[PDB]
Amino acid sequence: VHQAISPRTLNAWVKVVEEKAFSPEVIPMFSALSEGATPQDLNTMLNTVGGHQAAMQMLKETINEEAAEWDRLHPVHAGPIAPGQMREPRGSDIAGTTSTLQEQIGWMTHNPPIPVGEIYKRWIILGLNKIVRMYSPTSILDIRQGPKEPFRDYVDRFYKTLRAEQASQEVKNWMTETLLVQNANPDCKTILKALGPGATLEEMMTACQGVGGPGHKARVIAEAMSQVT
Amino acid sequence: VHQAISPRTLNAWVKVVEEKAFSPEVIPMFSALSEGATPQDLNTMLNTVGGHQAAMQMLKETINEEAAEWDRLHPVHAGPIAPGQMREPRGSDIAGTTSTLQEQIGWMTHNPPIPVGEIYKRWIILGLNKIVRMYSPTSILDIRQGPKEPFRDYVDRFYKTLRAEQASQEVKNWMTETLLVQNANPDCKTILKALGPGATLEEMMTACQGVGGPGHKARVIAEAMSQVT
Amino acid sequence: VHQAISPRTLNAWVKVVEEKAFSPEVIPMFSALSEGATPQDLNTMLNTVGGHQAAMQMLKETINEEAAEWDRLHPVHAGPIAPGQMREPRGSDIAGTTSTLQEQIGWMTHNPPIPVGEIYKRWIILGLNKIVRMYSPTSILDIRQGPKEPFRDYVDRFYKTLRAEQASQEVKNWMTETLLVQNANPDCKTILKALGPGATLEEMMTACQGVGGPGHKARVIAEAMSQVT
């Protein structure tokens, strides 16, 4: 079509997703970048969202709901071939799963036009609005050790979140060497600080392996009593 | 139709839901606002309920049960076209899922009349009665930290509830400023007050990160023994 | 039918359920009140049981098994119209789900008679016997705080049970004023008594919010040591 997305349009959409994630600003930008686009172009835009797999699953659920709504309003015709005309779209055709680009173009350019692109755009906008309201991406900054969480479990959660984090490898290494010790609970922080700089992750995990164990509990209790007595 | 809901009727229903939520007063108001309305108007009223999604799901379940009951009382005919007459309504037709507005008007104005609007209204009333009896909306005022609940889990619950709360953003900010520290458990509240005013949420979470850990338990036990000795 | 339930019969059944709940005395009364009644009348009696939803679900399950047994023993005929006679009942027809009142009267008054009312009555009697043996209604008197249960969870259980309780509103308020503090665990009961009369529920929950937390445990341990030393 005339309004097929240009290379700069697609790149702008990619950069919007990468920089803003799913802040409200994503909704206008998508609306502005995808106007006149076929459902195939919209699917191309959706497929370039790296990460946020849970958010994209949420979006797909919303699209399926809206497709079911469309199918409820549009009943399947009683098998009239109508060789002059073409088949009426279904919800899956609007979402582009069961329709080709030629069919979408034909629906968009027919008289009267069926703007399958704009209908799909509204479905996607509903999904994006739901994501913006509900979804919260994981953040490495939010990973803190629980007061009773073993240090190894905390480290596992930290590294899982770090793997999912959007950052360069150097930045992730820097995050490892600051946040991991920073966001440990006080009991493990004391041990890790006493361990000193240059301690490896294995040394750190060995040093905190007994926190919450009977011996460590006895030790800290006895130290507290000695201080207050 | 003559009794189609007016703009003021729809706005009054919206304001009723926003002001009273699902107090018993909702039941008369709905009854008064929806009399003579087609099932399409009733669905329009139901779609304007913002929030209370669990209550609306309960209402939908009740509507489905009543539609099944109607289907049990009304057997589908043995395919008599009856071109002079029209097809008999099903339960989904009364709820408006499988019927159009024209069909609803045709049933409502036929002689003898099938008041699909009134039947659907009674089903909705049953759902509303169930909601009024059972459903309790979440309240930010009810979020209190458990005696052994970690402060971060409490903060997550608080912010989830605040997100679901019906309030302006300034009011939500004021709620964060007061209720969060107010409704923490005594162990965390002692630390939070020791921090003083002006502490951020991150400083507050770091300060309470050790509550329940071995070191904090030893410290408070030692302080108690020193006081009693 | 000649033995259709009278207004006084239905009201007597309602009063029997309200006063006796599902004590064994319910089984004779039902038997006495429902003799000669159609399945329609029996369903009317079953629908007037307010509350005891779990017991009624048990009764429905028993009725379904008995209907399945009837269907096992009665095979569907090989489609003989038999215009002189009527269709043979199925289990669902005896339970009244798939049968109209006219069909039930026709079966009951046919020669030889098929006493669908009496068969359905025996199914209901089996269900009632099962309820009498197994089902135990929830009681506000039985709601007591566990030794380690947080006060807020106990209060939530108490208020849920109170909502399900069969009592006047004034009686429920009196129960709240007596049983809630009466049935708290000793640790919370001490604090609640120290509050004194006139404390609100919010002040009660605040006062017990720390029971089970480290500070409260340190306090009580130190107090016990001081008393024994």
Place this chain on the structure above:
Amino acid sequence: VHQAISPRTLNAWVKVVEEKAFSPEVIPMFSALSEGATPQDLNTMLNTVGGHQAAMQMLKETINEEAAEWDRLHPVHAGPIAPGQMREPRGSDIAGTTSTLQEQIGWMTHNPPIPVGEIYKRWIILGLNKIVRMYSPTSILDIRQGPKEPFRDYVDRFYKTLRAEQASQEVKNWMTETLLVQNANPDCKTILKALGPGATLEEMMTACQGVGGPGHKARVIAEAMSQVT
């Protein structure tokens, strides 16, 4: 008629208004949710705005201004219209006040099309932009007692604003419990604090009834003079 508002679209619009009020975010959401909608659908969306009646009146004034502009640009055509042709829309027809849904659909689905829905959407967007720039909703947090304002007048303003506030009834009770005394002027606030907790609204009003009168002025002047010497 393919782009009619779905139940989820209308609910999303309602939630947008309830959550964001008239922050700038409302403008993209509206434009995203109303694409291809008829003027009737747009009016339905506008009627679901609960509260903000003054803002809605500003929007209606903007719409009337734009309709007047349209009428100035499009002069009426004297003489009967052609039987095949339809009447040209006026501003009121675009706004949906004097046009039925069928007429709007006919205008939109025509060769060449008159996009009455999109023109009306632009008018509504102008109104929303004016609201976002100028309208400021009343907030209970901004009700402060003036230095010379009688306490009763301040209480009246507080309760009017609280009635207008978008909040649950429990939240409104909490706001009364906190802000009313918190936001009184110092002269009334010292007396209100001297009253002590648990004071009723009538006791608070009678306690502050004399602030500003000759006796209170004489008393405070004498006390200040005694403090000085």
Place this chain on the structure above:
Amino acid sequence: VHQAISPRTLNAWVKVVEEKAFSPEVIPMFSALSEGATPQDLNTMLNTVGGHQAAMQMLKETINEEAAEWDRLHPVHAGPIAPGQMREPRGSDIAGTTSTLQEQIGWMTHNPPIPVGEIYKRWIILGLNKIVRMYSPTSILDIRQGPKEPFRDYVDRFYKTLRAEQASQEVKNWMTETLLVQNANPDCKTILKALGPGATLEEMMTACQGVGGPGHKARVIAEAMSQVT
């Protein structure tokens, strides 16, 4: 005709208005008592409301708005009606201002029926809801003297409110003897108490005629300064 309001129905509505004023209970009650009634019966019910003329004016405004909306939905035809046919009702006809009882009956008893009574009752319900939400009746208990308000002006406000108050003459006299001095401002209250019991309204007004004047203010400053000396 069949559902015309009985004498007991009218009396029950009168008692409802007198006992509850415009509490929310007025809405279901009016809904129940007015079912099937003609616009003439509804107008009689509305005319039997004694007092609350501001609320009744609000109701009339709402009715006029709803009549205008109905007129917008129902364009005036050329009216070449057959002798058997009858003129289509307008908003004023539904409200009963321009329609006789016979015309309302004819619209209500017609094929297809035009339920003018029920449409009118919905308009009245919208007005009643507006009243319940917004209107607040004047209460003699709320009349308090302002801190700088002249005593004579307070007396005039009190007597105006007392004249408007719904109460027996003996209760009004008791109100005058109880609340007038009670709800005066502290300076006037001090003088009135010094005046002792048995003083008439003229002595009470003369005793407080100088409060806030130069002599009284100078006197109170002198007494306060002497007290703190």
